Design an enzyme around this catalytic site. Structure first.
Site, PDB file in Angstrom:
ATOM      1  N   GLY A 174      -1.367  10.655   9.459  1.00 55.27           N
ATOM      2  CA  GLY A 174      -2.759  10.255   9.541  1.00 55.27           C
ATOM      3  C   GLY A 174      -2.944   8.754   9.450  1.00 55.27           C
ATOM      4  O   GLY A 174      -3.778   8.180  10.152  1.00 55.27           O
TER       5      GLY A 174
ATOM      6  N   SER B 270       1.874  -0.111  -6.444  1.00 51.81           N
ATOM      7  CA  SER B 270       1.797   0.716  -5.238  1.00 51.81           C
ATOM      8  C   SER B 270       2.732   1.915  -5.289  1.00 51.81           C
ATOM      9  O   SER B 270       2.332   3.035  -4.962  1.00 51.81           O
ATOM     10  CB  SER B 270       2.132  -0.120  -3.993  1.00 51.81           C
ATOM     11  OG  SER B 270       1.107  -1.048  -3.701  1.00 51.81           O
TER      12      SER B 270
ATOM     13  N   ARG C  82      -7.953   4.214   5.950  1.00 55.88           N
ATOM     14  CA  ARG C  82      -9.379   4.507   6.020  1.00 55.88           C
ATOM     15  C   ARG C  82     -10.124   4.384   4.690  1.00 55.88           C
ATOM     16  O   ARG C  82      -9.519   4.357   3.617  1.00 55.88           O
ATOM     17  CB  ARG C  82      -9.603   5.906   6.606  1.00 55.88           C
ATOM     18  CG  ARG C  82      -9.243   6.041   8.085  1.00 55.88           C
ATOM     19  CD  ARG C  82      -9.350   7.488   8.561  1.00 55.88           C
ATOM     20  NE  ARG C  82      -8.949   8.436   7.521  1.00 55.88           N
ATOM     21  CZ  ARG C  82      -9.244   9.734   7.531  1.00 55.88           C
ATOM     22  NH1 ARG C  82      -9.944  10.256   8.532  1.00 55.88           N
ATOM     23  NH2 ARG C  82      -8.837  10.514   6.536  1.00 55.88           N
TER      24      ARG C  82
ATOM     25  N   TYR D 113       1.875   5.455  -6.155  1.00 58.38           N
ATOM     26  CA  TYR D 113       1.067   6.317  -5.299  1.00 58.38           C
ATOM     27  C   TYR D 113       1.877   7.070  -4.259  1.00 58.38           C
ATOM     28  O   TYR D 113       1.321   7.793  -3.443  1.00 58.38           O
ATOM     29  CB  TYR D 113      -0.069   5.529  -4.646  1.00 58.38           C
ATOM     30  CG  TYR D 113      -1.018   4.917  -5.648  1.00 58.38           C
ATOM     31  CD1 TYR D 113      -2.135   5.615  -6.095  1.00 58.38           C
ATOM     32  CD2 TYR D 113      -0.775   3.657  -6.179  1.00 58.38           C
ATOM     33  CE1 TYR D 113      -3.000   5.062  -7.032  1.00 58.38           C
ATOM     34  CE2 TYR D 113      -1.629   3.096  -7.111  1.00 58.38           C
ATOM     35  CZ  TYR D 113      -2.736   3.805  -7.540  1.00 58.38           C
ATOM     36  OH  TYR D 113      -3.578   3.252  -8.477  1.00 58.38           O
TER      37      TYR D 113
ATOM     38  N   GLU E  33      -5.294  -5.942  -8.085  1.00 57.86           N
ATOM     39  CA  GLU E  33      -5.568  -5.099  -6.933  1.00 57.86           C
ATOM     40  C   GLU E  33      -6.547  -5.834  -6.046  1.00 57.86           C
ATOM     41  O   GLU E  33      -7.392  -6.589  -6.527  1.00 57.86           O
ATOM     42  CB  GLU E  33      -6.089  -3.699  -7.290  1.00 57.86           C
ATOM     43  CG  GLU E  33      -6.615  -3.516  -8.688  1.00 57.86           C
ATOM     44  CD  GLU E  33      -6.847  -2.055  -9.008  1.00 57.86           C
ATOM     45  OE1 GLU E  33      -7.771  -1.462  -8.419  1.00 57.86           O
ATOM     46  OE2 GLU E  33      -6.070  -1.482  -9.801  1.00 57.86           O
TER      47      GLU E  33
ATOM     48  N   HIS F 108       0.845  -1.188   0.000  1.00 53.51           N
ATOM     49  CA  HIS F 108       0.000   0.000   0.000  1.00 53.51           C
ATOM     50  C   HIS F 108       0.881   1.238   0.000  1.00 53.51           C
ATOM     51  O   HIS F 108       1.612   1.497   0.959  1.00 53.51           O
ATOM     52  CB  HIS F 108      -1.002   0.052   1.152  1.00 53.51           C
ATOM     53  CG  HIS F 108      -2.025   1.140   0.997  1.00 53.51           C
ATOM     54  ND1 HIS F 108      -1.797   2.444   1.388  1.00 53.51           N
ATOM     55  CD2 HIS F 108      -3.255   1.133   0.433  1.00 53.51           C
ATOM     56  CE1 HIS F 108      -2.855   3.181   1.106  1.00 53.51           C
ATOM     57  NE2 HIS F 108      -3.751   2.412   0.515  1.00 53.51           N
ATOM     58  N   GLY F 109       0.843   1.976  -1.102  1.00 53.62           N
ATOM     59  CA  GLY F 109       1.631   3.182  -1.238  1.00 53.62           C
ATOM     60  C   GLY F 109       0.760   4.406  -1.061  1.00 53.62           C
ATOM     61  O   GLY F 109      -0.442   4.367  -1.325  1.00 53.62           O
ATOM     62  N   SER F 110       1.371   5.496  -0.611  1.00 58.51           N
ATOM     63  CA  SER F 110       0.670   6.755  -0.400  1.00 58.51           C
ATOM     64  C   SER F 110       1.711   7.865  -0.304  1.00 58.51           C
ATOM     65  O   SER F 110       2.902   7.585  -0.163  1.00 58.51           O
ATOM     66  CB  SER F 110      -0.149   6.691   0.894  1.00 58.51           C
ATOM     67  OG  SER F 110      -1.130   7.709   0.928  1.00 58.51           O
TER      68      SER F 110
HETATM   69  N1  LIG Z   1      -2.493   2.974  -2.839  1.00 53.41           N
HETATM   70  C1  LIG Z   1      -2.055   1.748  -3.270  1.00 53.41           C
HETATM   71  O1  LIG Z   1      -1.050   1.152  -2.901  1.00 53.41           O
HETATM   72  C2  LIG Z   1      -2.917   1.154  -4.292  1.00 53.41           C
HETATM   73  C3  LIG Z   1      -2.627  -0.095  -4.786  1.00 53.41           C
HETATM   74  C4  LIG Z   1      -3.411  -0.678  -5.756  1.00 53.41           C
HETATM   75  C5  LIG Z   1      -4.504  -0.040  -6.298  1.00 53.41           C
HETATM   76  C6  LIG Z   1      -4.791   1.220  -5.809  1.00 53.41           C
HETATM   77  N2  LIG Z   1      -5.812   2.062  -6.153  1.00 53.41           N
HETATM   78  C7  LIG Z   1      -5.688   3.132  -5.395  1.00 53.41           C
HETATM   79  C8  LIG Z   1      -6.545   4.297  -5.388  1.00 53.41           C
HETATM   80  C9  LIG Z   1      -6.036   5.523  -5.022  1.00 53.41           C
HETATM   81  C10 LIG Z   1      -6.837   6.645  -5.032  1.00 53.41           C
HETATM   82  C11 LIG Z   1      -8.160   6.553  -5.401  1.00 53.41           C
HETATM   83  C12 LIG Z   1      -9.047   7.743  -5.445  1.00 53.41           C
HETATM   84  C13 LIG Z   1      -8.813   8.466  -6.746  1.00 53.41           C
HETATM   85  C14 LIG Z   1      -9.842   9.560  -6.883  1.00 53.41           C
HETATM   86  C15 LIG Z   1      -9.719  10.525  -5.730  1.00 53.41           C
HETATM   87  C16 LIG Z   1      -9.827   9.794  -4.413  1.00 53.41           C
HETATM   88  N3  LIG Z   1      -8.784   8.743  -4.391  1.00 53.41           N
HETATM   89  C17 LIG Z   1      -8.677   5.332  -5.757  1.00 53.41           C
HETATM   90  C18 LIG Z   1      -7.875   4.217  -5.748  1.00 53.41           C
HETATM   91  F1  LIG Z   1      -8.444   3.055  -6.101  1.00 53.41           F
HETATM   92  N4  LIG Z   1      -4.596   2.999  -4.583  1.00 53.41           N
HETATM   93  C19 LIG Z   1      -4.017   1.787  -4.822  1.00 53.41           C
END
Ligand SMILES: NC(=O)c1cccc2nc(-c3ccc([C@@H]4CCCCN4)cc3F)[nH]c12
Length: 348
Positions: A209, A242, A216, A245, A326, A200-202
């Site tokens: 947070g 990941s 969350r 992100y 995913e 999980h990347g961010s």
């Molecule tokens: N984070 C991970 O490692 C990660 C890993 C795999 C799939 C992933 N899909 C996401 C994702 C991020 C943001 C949003 C939405 C986009 C629109 C605005 C609100 N956030 C939606 C998502 F589905 N993250 C993933």
């Protein structure tokens, strides 16, 4: 502080105030009108609502003007500085997705700021140790020459490709993490087979947070555009998916990435976007089928936890709109954050 160096550096990294302001300005936000200390949760919720109304206006085909008032309303709430030509008109799914993406981030920056401001800003104890407590997370360093490190590093190596080789990955530090609470919350979901150690990347700015509140699920007011499988917690089994992100760049080539054990249960498998939310009976998670997958033969284990560190190969199906797999869970309790990695991105 009594904390190890690496942890002390991790702490400084996530509570970086300049990083917060940098994230804003990056968004074209006017810091003079909307400074850090002015960020509000209620105002972000209200902003989310405007975004949702725009989505609806876009889907219906609102006779414009209404789309103009919506747009004006959003920029009045979240004050941006464009200079001239006027702010972009939120008149398409692509627009709202971007703005929503910014709201999620601002939300975590606000959380990090209020957390970093609350408590006793006294010099009795060192700031590092004080801020370390606010995270409510136990953080330990994982030694380079340990089986843990070896496994993790291999997972990073194998799941990193080439068609997504704008950079190479270097693992600088590995931390074992245990959020105070998340441990009894996950115990029950343990009686759920199919447990996997996923990525999980961010953004770095979201980490205070995340460690403080855990991963969350987007709130009800948030528009749903941008979530291929509805509002949930997304994971990948290939660090390449990941790592995208972490939003790093030649400017700041270092990012943070999590490794969590998620009790998937029986997976509802799909190849295209679908706003689920309500899983079919017997299913406890969704799996989006991608074109690439880690070699199943190379899969390894650990106390019932599957670690798909096999090298990326072509999967059975290619009739999918996904390059990678995913996994989505709709219950925060199905997640047990286990590791945090400090990574350096080396671009080519
Ligand atoms: N984070 C991970 O490692 C990660 C890993 C795999 C799939 C992933 N899909 C996401 C994702 C991020 C943001 C949003 C939405 C986009 C629109 C605005 C609100 N956030 C939606 C998502 F589905 N993250 C993933």
């Amino acid at each position: 502080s009594k904390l190890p160096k690496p942890v002390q550096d991790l702490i400084k990294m996530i509570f970086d105030v300049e990083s917060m302001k940098k994230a804003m300005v990056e968004y074209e936000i006017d810091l003079q009108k909307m400074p850090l200390g002015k960020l509000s949760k209620r105002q972000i919720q209200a902003a989310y609502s405007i975004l949702s109304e725009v989505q609806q206006a876009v889907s219906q085909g609102s006779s414009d003007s209404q789309i103009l008032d919506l747009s004006n309303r959003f920029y009045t709430l979240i004050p941006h500085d464009f200079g001239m030509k006027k702010p972009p008109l939120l008149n398409n799914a692509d627009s709202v997705q971007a703005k929503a993406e910014m709201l999620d981030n601002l939300l975590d920056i606000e959380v990090a700021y209020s957390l970093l401001r609350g408590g006793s800003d006294d010099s009795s104890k060192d700031p590092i140790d004080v801020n370390y407590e606010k995270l409510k997370t136990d953080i330990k360093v994982v030694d380079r020459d340990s089986e843990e490190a070896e496994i993790i590093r291999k997972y990073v190596k194998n799941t990193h490709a080439t068609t997504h080789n704008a950079y190479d990955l270097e693992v600088i530090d590995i931390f074992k993490i245990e959020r105070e609470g998340e441990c009894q919350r996950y115990k029950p979901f343990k009686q759920l087979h199919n447990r996997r150690l996923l990525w999980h990347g961010s953004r770095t700015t979201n980490f205070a947070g995340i460690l403080s509140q855990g991963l969350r699920i987007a709130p009800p007011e948030a528009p749903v555009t941008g979530y291929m499988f509805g509002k949930g917690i997304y994971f990948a089994d290939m660090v390449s998916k990941s790592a995208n992100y972490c939003h790093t760049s030649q400017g700041d080539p270092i990012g943070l990435i999590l490794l969590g054990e998620v009790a998937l249960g029986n997976m509802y498998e799909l190849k295209h976007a679908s706003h689920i939310s309500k899983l079919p009976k017997g299913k406890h998670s969704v799996k989006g089928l991608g074109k690439t997958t880690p070699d199943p033969s190379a899969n390894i284990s650990l106390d019932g936890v599957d670690v798909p560190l096999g090298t990326g190969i072509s999967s059975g199906v290619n009739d999918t709109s996904l390059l990678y797999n995913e996994y989505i869970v709709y219950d925060i309790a199905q997640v047990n954050l286990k590791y945090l990695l400090k990574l350096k991105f080396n671009f080519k």
